[PDB]
């Protein structure tokens, strides 16, 4: 009665999740015709079934967004009982506030409901208030505990968590609480606010895109006395020259999760990727079986 | 082209067909609204309108052609941006409506994408739509906001009329396009014939000038096979025409190597600069759409057009 | 738990369907007061029940449409679990496109959802895109296979399927595919496009209303060499002089289905009526039990 | 009657009450919008507006009287047609609101048809409504679009005042109409009395001129029984009045054979040409509705009226 | 699987109802911060549960309305299966018609649905057409039978039911039918229409607010020949000087129900309070178990 | 103040902040719309607009401050009243947005009240909103109707600039307010420092004039503790400021007894007349909001402001 489908964004994450929960991915067909149009065909009856769709809205966001919406349409029209969306990475999440700009994080939310979505399971939205962009139920999972565990196990002396900017202090502090460490912040107006002399710095962000911000912060820490610099994020967008910039940086090791598929192309030298696979598989089971999802936060 | 005199009419162009959009604006007499549609390295689209449009009637010109998904998204984001900046109205001029084909795959559990698009456009905040030659006229019923549907057949007809042709027969490429072939046949007082690919011909095409008409020419497999079977059955000559030149895949090579004397299309879809069609004529829908926007904005009768 | 109700359009079809699935029709009351107003009263508790309403929106369409909407309102307000509409004939289906006309096929759809409908089961809509007029689930049944079977069993030599016009070629061809026959079409601008000399013609349409189109086509076929003319449609609207025109025509036999009740009044001489009763009863069971409805098309 | 001077005000009439609709248009000073509401042989209604109304404020005059289902449908289809032809506004003037009776059948699992209608009208696309003497004033709450509710009592009162009557008592036909009898009693500074059919009389009606008032007179069973019991209890005389003359079934014969001296009604519902009431007076709501449409269109105070 | 919560309006009624149906009230938290804002926190997982909320929208109506809406929001966002609202007293019910006034009874209804309500159970709405203000299911319970039983048991000779005004005649008559008594009405334009000489009068209304209307009617009855005056209503709003006015009136006994909590403050001397507790507990069970609720009216 | 000359602009005040509302109206040049918001003995709110506003653009000024529930309700009822009286637009000017705090209680199963409010306002019938210093800028995303968000920081900055201060450091009271401290630091070309209460200080505050900035000062526990720890760590002096003076509970006594040299706030929330702050300065948002309403009404650029 529970059917899980995967689309093109992150097929491997979807498979890992399916193996853990114990189902074969649903029979669907995702064709792209020669003129660029996409067509999904549900290759099996899903009438009366609770359907889960696993899709990160990563590069190319607009293709991933449309195939997800078109698939929801096909399931709604094929009489699915529920259409539950599992989103490891929420694209356009940085477009969450307005000078004559759209609020794309909100537009997508409205689009998703319009298409027929029942509920959403999300992981580390750029802003916690993005939950409020929905009127359908949404269960928000956090990735900070996963990154925090890995660092807690590295036997690092003298650490200070560093927020790459003014908007990342809250996140920095959740990590500094978990690790019992002080916080410093970069104030590119690029000044270092806080004590980092001799300390092992851990730069943290939710998303690492072009990596300009992170590598620059890293270089600044090192020439201001930091013993060493580590860097982590939940979502590895890593577009453009991101990878190169990181390989040449002073960043000892970069730690990311697998919410976004890694560039087949470019390789990161000092890197560690943690899986959110178990977290999502478990959240899917509890949502479907109506157990407590919040048991997952404490 | 500044000459319009209603500073309250704004026209924006997205990336699908900037040339057509420029032509329309020029004809109307106004400069393209100022905005920037950029794509960050991660493929996300960013839009920021560069002049206040608060209280203005805005017109967005976008064909949802290859790649349809990107063009739909920038269109939706553009509308969200104008809605939030307090535009008075957000009018959508769609020269080509992507996903309008409902039969593409002959399957069971399919989506009805042309309907999903309509719902999405309305949700984004569209006030109305101006469309041209929708694949099926009942797509108008997919909207609950006003939609004005323009016909491209008169333009094509007027062109063929000017060629002074003898013994013509309008040919429908398949079963679904007989109504459309009939409209051209009426404009040209010519009989019709249809290709029954199951590849037979219903009608007398012998020693006549055949004109193949379809709404869309995509891979060109259908139209070229229909042109060849036409000639080899005695048609003296074959012209082909359509409103929307999708021309994907091998379309061009197929056309260049076929017996089609001349292919006639409109500029509702931007042509591939890459490859050239040899025997080709392109008619413009710029004046037709420009006239439509003016009558809609000023509240004049547009049915008069079409 | 499954309750089936019938309204005034086609009580006999409703009864046949109820007998096949194995239920007594629900206890409802359809009163028309002296001033013309209608009042439905559900004569039994249907709280928590999945309710099916059988109604063709045939002559008078506006009365049939309103009693259906008022009944949906009473069931919604009486806490029905689901309100499933079974529509053998969809009136106003020819009003599916716009010069300053409404798109009544779309208006009705919106009205139906507004009133509280859960889903729809339809049979041979004038246009397949009318399915897209709904946002609630709709399962579209075809009648061509039923008419096609009957002709396949008549031992007719030399046949050609004839589309009475430009808009009926697709339908004609589905019948010509099933019967392995060529197609011809009438081009009233009234010319016959295609070879019909000595052939047995079968004129096909979805709806036969005043029958002017069909009888004229039939007369034209016969004076252009056709050995004989048969005629069929799924929906027998047959209004005005329809019947007389058919009785005097050259039409050997007219074949229709029972999606619309036959005029108690006027009688057709050479005629055959096939029942969609089994098709709908079966579609109702599969929808309710969540089996595959598409198994019914192949 | 061309004299209005705001070519932007359009008024349409459907089939329920063309005479009333003509009177209103005449008074306003405009010609009835051009359209054709035809019914094909199969009973389907076809509408096609014969002049552009794009950008115009349209007023539709339709009472949903016998047969209510047909009149509702043509009204809904008319609105869909105007919405899709780009009307600026679609204003509904309903002289008589069908299905406004909620108690007709005393059952359990009933529909609330007056609410369903409101939802349907809004869904079709109505901008606002102008109504007259709704059976229950809270039906105004059934709408989420603006609704202006006009009262017919002043017109009736003004008529009775002009008769110079002595010793009058306003009689409520039943328990639900006491508030309405009270309003007339206020206009005429007269006391009230009520018929408690369980058929007793609460109040002193002895040797007085009784005036029975109701909102609707349908089969006339209630009003005639109430008039007879009135006379036989000593009332010197009995007048009867209402806003809406539904007059279905035996209504007329019952009235003609009753003791009602004179029945007074308005023209909110078209009268049966077939049968004649003998002692009868019909007051017009044409001027009242015409004045309402003008103030709504020009944005003037209409509460001033009512 | 059935969880019942109570908010601040009438905690005792909620408890009585919970005891009868056989559940402990749900674990929720209703905090009012120092600046006046309210925060509800569901202290237990209610995922997949049918939740009932017991709240009268009595003084202060706006606080009671908001805490109810905020609670519905928290349950909707915490994935409740259904959110069923039980409303013993419906505030703003007198704002049911429009000169440039709002129709607050309708606004609240729209607000309730917007917040996420599934259905409503109501008791004696000011106007029966207020049921039509909703599009979600609503089951309307009557209190007249409860007041009527109590009077039927008092051995009162010569009774006449009295409507305090023009709008209360229908209600008066339902009570006069149950008791086989004649009706009289007060016509404050303050005249007494009907025979009350020597009779025992029972003044009836739905709501007794400031009690000016009722006490004045009572005084008028007594100086016009009435042997004695009784007074009843379903909803005891009793605000301002209500209580004092009643204690000094000629009203022999005032009978009310417990749909609204009684002023802790002021005491009524000759009074009787009947409980709607059993009625609501029973309606809750039948709604939840899908039995017939209308069995409760006859 | 009658001088505006667009009889079509109406401005109403509810009970949250009548003084601010009066100031705005005065500046604009119009008299407060006429209405009565009364509360019957039972606490129900009654509203009845005393002049026709049919066709007028109406502006409602209401802060949803203590008690937020009453103020929200009168606001919602006011909108229902204007919608039903046929106002053309219903524009909401919210100087202070109650329930904008999402972290107040650190629990699991919570409501998102700021979102519920937005949905309710839209449902009531709001056309648009004008807000000032929302607690989180993404609350703008909670609305699907246009919302113009004004910033109070420039006003505060301009005041501090006029004091001619030396060696200043802008201090963020907590982790969530670093972006806001940064904006003031930009206006004053000053570095920033943050209080890491887990109560340590990140940044050099030694011998400097510290300026604490927050959006809201409620019980004042956070700001006063942050001011004290500042001084005892060597800050030469401490100023404190915020846009919204909620000042609930012991706020005032705490401030009066702290080391804050001067507390600066705006008049977005009505101050308690009861208790006085000793070292205090109140800047007005009346001119800022008045300018915003005019540009919105006349369709001028308001981003120019903020």
UniProtKB/Swiss-Prot annotation, chains A, C, E:
Organism, scientific name? Bacillus subtilis (strain 168)
Q: In its UniProt entry, what is this protein called?
A: Ribose-phosphate pyrophosphokinase
Cofactor binding note from Swiss-Prot or TrEMBL = Binds 2 Mg(2+) ions per subunit. Each Mg(2+) binds only one residue (His-126 and Asp-165, respectively) of this protein, however the magnesium ions also bind substrates and water molecules to complete their coordination spheres. Can also use Mn(2+) and Cd(2+) ions, but the activity is less than that obtained with Mg(2+) ions.
The signal peptide stretch is none
Active site: residue positions: 188
Compartment(s): Cytoplasm
Q: What is its EC number?
A: 2.7.6.1
Which keywords does the record carry?
Allosteric enzyme, ATP-binding, Cytoplasm, Kinase, Magnesium, Metal-binding, Nucleotide biosynthesis, Nucleotide-binding, Transferase
Q: Which GO cellular component terms, listed alphabetically, does the Swiss-Prot or TrEMBL entry include?
A: cytoplasm; ribose phosphate diphosphokinase complex
Q: Which SUPFAM superfamilies match?
A: PRTase-like (SSF53271)
Residues that bind Mg(2+) 1: 126
- State the reactions this protein catalyses: D-ribose 5-phosphate + ATP = 5-phospho-alpha-D-ribose 1-diphosphate + AMP + H(+)
Q: Which pathway is it part of? A: Metabolic intermediate biosynthesis; 5-phospho-alpha-D-ribose 1-diphosphate biosynthesis; 5-phospho-alpha-D-ribose 1-diphosphate from D-ribose 5-phosphate (route I): step 1/1
Query: Which of this chain's residues are annotated to bind Mg(2+) 2?
Result: 165
Share any extra remarks.
This enzyme uses a steady state ordered mechanism, where Mg(2+) binds first, followed by Mg-ATP and lastly, ribose 5-phosphate.
Enumerate the residues binding D-ribose 5-phosphate. 205, 209-213
Read off the CDD domains from this record: PRTases_typeI
From Swiss-Prot, chains B, D, F:
Q: Where does ATP bind?
A: 42-44, 101-102
Which species is this record about?
Bacillus subtilis (strain 168)
Q: What does the record note about the cofactor?
A: Binds 2 Mg(2+) ions per subunit. Each Mg(2+) binds only one residue (His-135 and Asp-174, respectively) of this protein, however the magnesium ions also bind substrates and water molecules to complete their coordination spheres. Can also use Mn(2+) and Cd(2+) ions, but the activity is less than that obtained with Mg(2+) ions.
Question: Any idea what this protein is called?
Answer: Ribose-phosphate pyrophosphokinase
Q: Which cofactors is this protein said to need? A: Mg(2+)
Which annotated residues bind Mg(2+) 1? 135
EC category name: transferase
Superkingdom, according to UniProt? Bacteria
PROSITE patterns linked:
PRPP_SYNTHASE
Task: Give the residue spans that cross the bilayer.
Answer: none
Something else known? This enzyme uses a steady state ordered mechanism, where Mg(2+) binds first, followed by Mg-ATP and lastly, ribose 5-phosphate.
């Amino acid at each position: 009665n529970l059917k899980i489908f995967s689309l093109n964004s992150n097929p491997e994450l979807a498979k890992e999740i399916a193996d853990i929960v114990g189902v074969q991915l649903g029979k669907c067909s995702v064709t792209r015709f020669s003129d660029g149009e996409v067509q999904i065909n549900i290759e099996e009856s899903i009438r009366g079934c609770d359907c889960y769709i696993i899709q990160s809205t990563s590069d190319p966001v607009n293709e991933h967004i449309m195939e997800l919406l078109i698939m929801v349409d096909a399931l709604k029209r094929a009489s699915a009982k529920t259409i539950n969306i599992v989103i490891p990475y929420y694209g356009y999440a940085r477009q969450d506030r307005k000078s004559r700009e759209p609020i794309t994080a909100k537009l997508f939310a409205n689009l998703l409901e319009t298409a027929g979505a029942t509920r959403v399971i999300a992981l580390d939205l750029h802003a916690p208030q993005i939950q409020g962009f929905f009127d359908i139920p949404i269960d928000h999972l956090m990735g900070v505990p996963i990154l925090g565990e890995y660092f807690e196990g590295k036997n690092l002396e003298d650490i200070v968590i560093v927020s790459p900017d003014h908007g990342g202090v809250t996140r920095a502090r959740k990590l500094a609480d978990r690790l019992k460490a002080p916080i410093a912040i970069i104030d590119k107006r690029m000044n270092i606010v806080g004590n980092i002399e001799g300390k092992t710095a851990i730069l943290i962000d939710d998303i690492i895109d072009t990596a300009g911000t992170i590598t620059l912060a890293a270089n600044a820490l090192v020439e201001n006395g930091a013993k060493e610099v580590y860097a982590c994020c939940t979502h590895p967008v890593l577009s453009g020259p991101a990878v190169e910039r990181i390989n040449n940086s002073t960043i000892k090791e970069l730690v990311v999760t697998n919410s976004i598929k890694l560039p087949e192309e470019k390789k990161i030298e000092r890197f560690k990727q943690l899986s959110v696979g178990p977290l999502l598989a478990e959240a899917i089971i509890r949502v479907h079986e109506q157990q407590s999802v919040s048991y997952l936060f404490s």
